Short mmCIF file of C-alpha atoms and ligand atoms in Angstrom, two decimals:
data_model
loop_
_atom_site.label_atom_id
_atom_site.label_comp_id
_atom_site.label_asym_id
_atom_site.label_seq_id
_atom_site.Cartn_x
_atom_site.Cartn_y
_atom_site.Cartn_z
CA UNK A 1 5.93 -1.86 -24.86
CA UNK A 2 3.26 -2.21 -22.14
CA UNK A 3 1.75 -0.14 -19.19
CA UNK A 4 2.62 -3.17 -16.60
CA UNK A 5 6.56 -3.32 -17.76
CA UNK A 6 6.83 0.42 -18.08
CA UNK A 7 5.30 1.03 -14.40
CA UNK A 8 7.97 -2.00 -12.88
CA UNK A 9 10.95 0.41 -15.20
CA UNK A 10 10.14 3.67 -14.31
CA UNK A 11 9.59 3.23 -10.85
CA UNK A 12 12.76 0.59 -10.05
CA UNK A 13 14.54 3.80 -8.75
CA UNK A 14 12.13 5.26 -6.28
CA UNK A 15 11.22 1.38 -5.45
CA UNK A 16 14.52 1.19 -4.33
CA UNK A 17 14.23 4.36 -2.10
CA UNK A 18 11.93 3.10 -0.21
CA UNK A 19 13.43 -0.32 0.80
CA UNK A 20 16.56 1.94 1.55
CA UNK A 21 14.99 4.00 4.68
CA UNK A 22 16.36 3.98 7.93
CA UNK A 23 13.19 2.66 9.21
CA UNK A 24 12.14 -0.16 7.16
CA UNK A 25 16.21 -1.38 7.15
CA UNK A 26 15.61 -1.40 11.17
CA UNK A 27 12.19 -2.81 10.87
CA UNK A 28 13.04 -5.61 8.88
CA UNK A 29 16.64 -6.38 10.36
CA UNK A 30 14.87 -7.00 14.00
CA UNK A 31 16.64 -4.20 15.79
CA UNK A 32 13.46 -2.17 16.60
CA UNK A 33 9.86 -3.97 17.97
CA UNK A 34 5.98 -4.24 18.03
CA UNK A 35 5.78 -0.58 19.18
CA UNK A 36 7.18 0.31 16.08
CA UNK A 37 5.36 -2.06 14.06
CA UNK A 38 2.57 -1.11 15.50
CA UNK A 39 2.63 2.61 14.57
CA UNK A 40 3.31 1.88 10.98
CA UNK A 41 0.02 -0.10 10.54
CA UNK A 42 -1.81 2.64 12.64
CA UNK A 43 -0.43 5.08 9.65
CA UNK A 44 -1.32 2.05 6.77
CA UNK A 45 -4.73 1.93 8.58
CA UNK A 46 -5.36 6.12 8.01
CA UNK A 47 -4.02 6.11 4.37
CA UNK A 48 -5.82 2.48 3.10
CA UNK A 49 -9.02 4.33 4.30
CA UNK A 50 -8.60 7.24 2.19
CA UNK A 51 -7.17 5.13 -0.53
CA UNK A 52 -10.38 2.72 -0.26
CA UNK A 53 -12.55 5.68 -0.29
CA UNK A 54 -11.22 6.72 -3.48
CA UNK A 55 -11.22 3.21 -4.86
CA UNK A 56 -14.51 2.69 -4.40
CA UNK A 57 -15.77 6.46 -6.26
CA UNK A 58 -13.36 5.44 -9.27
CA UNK A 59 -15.48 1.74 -9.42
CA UNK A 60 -18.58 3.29 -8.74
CA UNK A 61 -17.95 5.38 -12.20
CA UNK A 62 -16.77 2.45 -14.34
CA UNK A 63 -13.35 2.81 -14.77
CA UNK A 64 -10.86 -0.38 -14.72
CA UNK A 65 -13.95 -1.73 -12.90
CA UNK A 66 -11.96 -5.44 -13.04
CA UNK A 67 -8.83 -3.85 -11.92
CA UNK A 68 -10.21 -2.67 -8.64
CA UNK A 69 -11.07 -5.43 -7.05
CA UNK A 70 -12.98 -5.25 -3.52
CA UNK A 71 -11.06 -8.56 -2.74
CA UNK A 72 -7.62 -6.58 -2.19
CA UNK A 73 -9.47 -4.14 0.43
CA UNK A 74 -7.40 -3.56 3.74
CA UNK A 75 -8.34 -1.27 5.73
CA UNK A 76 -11.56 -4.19 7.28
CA UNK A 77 -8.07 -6.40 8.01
CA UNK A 78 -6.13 -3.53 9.40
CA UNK A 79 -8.61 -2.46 11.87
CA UNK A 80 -8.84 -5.80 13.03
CA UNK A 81 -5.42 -6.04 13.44
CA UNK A 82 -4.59 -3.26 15.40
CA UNK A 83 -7.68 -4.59 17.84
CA UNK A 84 -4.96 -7.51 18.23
CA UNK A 85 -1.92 -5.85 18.27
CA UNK A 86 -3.08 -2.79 20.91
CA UNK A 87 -4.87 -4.87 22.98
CA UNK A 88 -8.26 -2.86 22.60
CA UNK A 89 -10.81 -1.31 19.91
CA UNK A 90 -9.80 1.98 21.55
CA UNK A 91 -7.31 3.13 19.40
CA UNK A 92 -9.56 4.42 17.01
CA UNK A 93 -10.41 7.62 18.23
CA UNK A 94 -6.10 7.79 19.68
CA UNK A 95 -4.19 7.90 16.40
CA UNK A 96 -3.01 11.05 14.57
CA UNK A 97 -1.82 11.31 11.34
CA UNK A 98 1.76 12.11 10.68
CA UNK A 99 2.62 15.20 8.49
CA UNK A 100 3.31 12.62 5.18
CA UNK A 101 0.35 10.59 6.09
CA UNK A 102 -1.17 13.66 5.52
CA UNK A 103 -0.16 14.92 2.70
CA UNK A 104 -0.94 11.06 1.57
CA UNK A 105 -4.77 11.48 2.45
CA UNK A 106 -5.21 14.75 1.26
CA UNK A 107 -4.13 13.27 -2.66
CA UNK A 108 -6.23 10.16 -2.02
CA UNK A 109 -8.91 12.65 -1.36
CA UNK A 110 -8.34 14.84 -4.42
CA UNK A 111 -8.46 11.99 -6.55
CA UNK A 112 -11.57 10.54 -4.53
CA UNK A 113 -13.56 14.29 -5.25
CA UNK A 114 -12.07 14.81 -8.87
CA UNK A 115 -12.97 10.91 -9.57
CA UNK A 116 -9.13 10.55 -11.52
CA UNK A 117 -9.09 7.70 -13.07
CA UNK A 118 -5.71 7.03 -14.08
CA UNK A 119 -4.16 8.55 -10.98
CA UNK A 120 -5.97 5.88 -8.74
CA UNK A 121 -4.91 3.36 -10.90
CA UNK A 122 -1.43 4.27 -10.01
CA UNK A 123 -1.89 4.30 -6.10
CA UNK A 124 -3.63 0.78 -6.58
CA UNK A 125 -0.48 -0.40 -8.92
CA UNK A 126 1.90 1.05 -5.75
CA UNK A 127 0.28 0.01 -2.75
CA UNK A 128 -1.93 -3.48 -3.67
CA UNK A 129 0.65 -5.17 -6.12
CA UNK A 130 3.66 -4.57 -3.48
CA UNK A 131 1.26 -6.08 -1.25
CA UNK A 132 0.58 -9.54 -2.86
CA UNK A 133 4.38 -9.75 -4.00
CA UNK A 134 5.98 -8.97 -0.81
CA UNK A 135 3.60 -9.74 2.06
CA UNK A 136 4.23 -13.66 3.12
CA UNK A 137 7.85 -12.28 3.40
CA UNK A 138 7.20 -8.90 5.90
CA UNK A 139 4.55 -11.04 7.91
CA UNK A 140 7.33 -13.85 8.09
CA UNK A 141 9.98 -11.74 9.26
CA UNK A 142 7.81 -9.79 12.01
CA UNK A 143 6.94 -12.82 13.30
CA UNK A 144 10.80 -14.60 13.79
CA UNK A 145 11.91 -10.67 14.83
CA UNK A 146 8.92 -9.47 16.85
CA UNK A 147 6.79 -12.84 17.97
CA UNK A 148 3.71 -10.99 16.14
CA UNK A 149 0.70 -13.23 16.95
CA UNK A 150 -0.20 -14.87 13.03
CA UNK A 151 -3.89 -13.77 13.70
CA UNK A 152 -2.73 -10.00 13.78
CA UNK A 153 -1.07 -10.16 10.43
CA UNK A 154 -4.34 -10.21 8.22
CA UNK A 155 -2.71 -7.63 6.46
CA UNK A 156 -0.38 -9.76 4.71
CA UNK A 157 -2.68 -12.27 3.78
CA UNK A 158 -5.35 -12.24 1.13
CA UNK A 159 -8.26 -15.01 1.50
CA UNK A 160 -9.97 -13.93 -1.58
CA UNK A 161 -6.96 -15.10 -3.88
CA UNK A 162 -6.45 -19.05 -4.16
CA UNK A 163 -3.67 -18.69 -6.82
CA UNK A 164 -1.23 -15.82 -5.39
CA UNK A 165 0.94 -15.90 -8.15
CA UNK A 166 -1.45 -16.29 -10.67
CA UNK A 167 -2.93 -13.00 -9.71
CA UNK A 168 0.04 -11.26 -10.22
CA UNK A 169 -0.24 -12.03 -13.38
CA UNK A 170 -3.65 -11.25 -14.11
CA UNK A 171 -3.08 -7.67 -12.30
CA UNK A 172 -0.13 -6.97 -14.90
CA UNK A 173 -2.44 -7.77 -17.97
CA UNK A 174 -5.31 -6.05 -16.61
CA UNK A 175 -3.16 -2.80 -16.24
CA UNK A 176 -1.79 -3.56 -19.93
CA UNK A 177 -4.96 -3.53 -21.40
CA UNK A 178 -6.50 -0.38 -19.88
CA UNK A 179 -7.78 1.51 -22.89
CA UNK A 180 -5.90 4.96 -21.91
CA UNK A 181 -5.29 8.51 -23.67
CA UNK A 182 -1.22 9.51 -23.97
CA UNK A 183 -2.43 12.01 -21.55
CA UNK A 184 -4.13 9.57 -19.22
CA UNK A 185 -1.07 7.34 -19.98
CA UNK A 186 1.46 9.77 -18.78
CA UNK A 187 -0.99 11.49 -16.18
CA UNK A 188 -0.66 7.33 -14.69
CA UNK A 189 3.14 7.45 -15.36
CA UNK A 190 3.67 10.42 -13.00
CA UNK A 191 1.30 9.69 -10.47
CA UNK A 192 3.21 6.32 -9.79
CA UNK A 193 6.78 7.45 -9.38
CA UNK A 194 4.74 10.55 -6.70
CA UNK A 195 2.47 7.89 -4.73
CA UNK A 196 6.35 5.97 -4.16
CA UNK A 197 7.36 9.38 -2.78
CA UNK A 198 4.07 9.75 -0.59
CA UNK A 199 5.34 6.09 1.14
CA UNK A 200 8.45 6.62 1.79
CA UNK A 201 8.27 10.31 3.38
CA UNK A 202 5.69 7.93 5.64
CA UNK A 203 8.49 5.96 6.44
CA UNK A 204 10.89 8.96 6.86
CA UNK A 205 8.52 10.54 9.50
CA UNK A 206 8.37 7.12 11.41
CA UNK A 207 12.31 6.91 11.34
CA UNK A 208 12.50 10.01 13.65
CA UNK A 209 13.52 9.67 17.34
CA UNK A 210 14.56 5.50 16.49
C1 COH B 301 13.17 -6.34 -0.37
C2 COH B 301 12.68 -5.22 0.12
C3 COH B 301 11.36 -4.70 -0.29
C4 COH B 301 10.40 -4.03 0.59
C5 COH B 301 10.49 -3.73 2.05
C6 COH B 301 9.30 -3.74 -0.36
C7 COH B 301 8.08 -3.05 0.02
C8 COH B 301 7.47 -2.12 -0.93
C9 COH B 301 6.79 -0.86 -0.58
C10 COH B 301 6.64 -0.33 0.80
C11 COH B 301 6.02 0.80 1.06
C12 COH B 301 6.34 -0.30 -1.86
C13 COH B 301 5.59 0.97 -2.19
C14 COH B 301 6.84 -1.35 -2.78
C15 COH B 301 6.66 -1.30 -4.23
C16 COH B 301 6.47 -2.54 -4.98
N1 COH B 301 7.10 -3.65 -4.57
CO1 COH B 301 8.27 -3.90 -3.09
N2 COH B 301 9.48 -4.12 -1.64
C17 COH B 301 10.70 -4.70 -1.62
C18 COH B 301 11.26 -5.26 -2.85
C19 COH B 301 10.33 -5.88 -3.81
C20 COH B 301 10.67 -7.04 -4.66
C21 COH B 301 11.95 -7.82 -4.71
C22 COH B 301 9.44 -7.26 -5.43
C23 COH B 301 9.15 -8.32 -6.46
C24 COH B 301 8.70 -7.75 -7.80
C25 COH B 301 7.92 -8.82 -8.52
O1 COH B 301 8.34 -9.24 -9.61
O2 COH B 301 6.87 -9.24 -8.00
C26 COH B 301 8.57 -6.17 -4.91
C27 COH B 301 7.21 -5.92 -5.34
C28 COH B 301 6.72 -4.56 -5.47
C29 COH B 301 5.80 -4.08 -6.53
C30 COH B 301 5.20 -4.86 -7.67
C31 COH B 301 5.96 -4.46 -8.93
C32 COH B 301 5.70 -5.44 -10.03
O3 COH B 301 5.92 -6.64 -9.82
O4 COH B 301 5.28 -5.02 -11.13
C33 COH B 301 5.63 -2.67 -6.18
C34 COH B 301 4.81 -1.61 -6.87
N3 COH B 301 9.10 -5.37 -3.97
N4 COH B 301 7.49 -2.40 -2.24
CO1 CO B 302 7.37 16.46 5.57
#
């Protein structure tokens, strides 16, 4: 076999990349704080925009319209967050966009303007199913290492789902039955293992200086 299984096979090695940085390790061991933690969802906030933006042209034109949910949106959550977490609305019009973020944006854009499909399907796959799998546990950890208010971790938590683990489920048989070309099929294949490289050169850029 299936698209859901191949997709969790393919992509075990970059997964494991990525929970391998120097920046997430210090993130999630406690030995950084809610500076740090802080710039990362600044960064999440500026590609989730331009990953929304493209969601919302590939729905518009019909494709995996039941995949793409509006319920998984972030980038509302985000921005309400960082209101929380910097104090002030004000950061808006403060935040720059490091060189992977990007480089991130600019292939969430292509994809927005060329309307691809199957290559959006594989950022949703990468960034919205790691979400609902690992988020109780990041949003548990930053608050027993940081103190992060629960209020300012909206992120993590999806009030459109009553059945968490249930959707997980339903997410993994609505990629398996996506009616897809070998071409689409492998266009999806190599778009996944490249948006895993996209996130953690974002987390390789946040590493520096730490
Ligand atoms: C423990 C460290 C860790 C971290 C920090 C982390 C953060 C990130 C991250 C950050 C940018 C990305 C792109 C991913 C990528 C993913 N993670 Co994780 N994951 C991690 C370990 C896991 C584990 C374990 C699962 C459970 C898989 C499952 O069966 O739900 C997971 C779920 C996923 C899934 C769903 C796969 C599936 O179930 O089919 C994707 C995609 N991810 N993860
Ligand atoms: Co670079």
């Amino acid at each position: 076999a299936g698209l859901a299984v191949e997709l969790k096979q393919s992509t075990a090695q970059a997964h494991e990349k990525a929970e391998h940085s120097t920046f997430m390790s210090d993130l999630l061991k406690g030995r950084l704080g809610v500076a740090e933690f802080t710039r990362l969802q600044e960064q999440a906030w500026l590609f989730y925009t331009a990953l929304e933006q493209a969601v919302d042209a590939v729905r518009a034109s019909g494709f995996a319209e039941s995949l793409l949910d509006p319920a998984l949106n972030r980038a509302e959550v985000l921005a309400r967050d960082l209101d929380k977490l910097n104090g002030s609305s004000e950061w808006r019009s403060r935040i720059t966009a490091s060189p992977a973020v990007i480089d991130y944006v600019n292939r969430l854009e292509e994809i927005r303007d060329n309307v691809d499909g199957p290559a959006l399907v594989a950022h949703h796959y990468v960034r919205y199913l790691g979400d609902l799998s690992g988020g109780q546990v990041k949003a548990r950890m930053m608050q027993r290492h940081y103190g992060v208010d629960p209020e300012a971790l909206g992120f993590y938590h999806f009030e459109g789902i009553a059945k968490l683990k249930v959707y997980k489920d339903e997410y993994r048989e609505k990629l398996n039955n996506l009616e897809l070309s070998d071409e689409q099929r492998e266009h999806l294949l190599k778009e996944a293992t490249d948006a895993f490289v996209f996130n953690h050169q974002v987390f390789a850029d946040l590493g520096k200086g730490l």
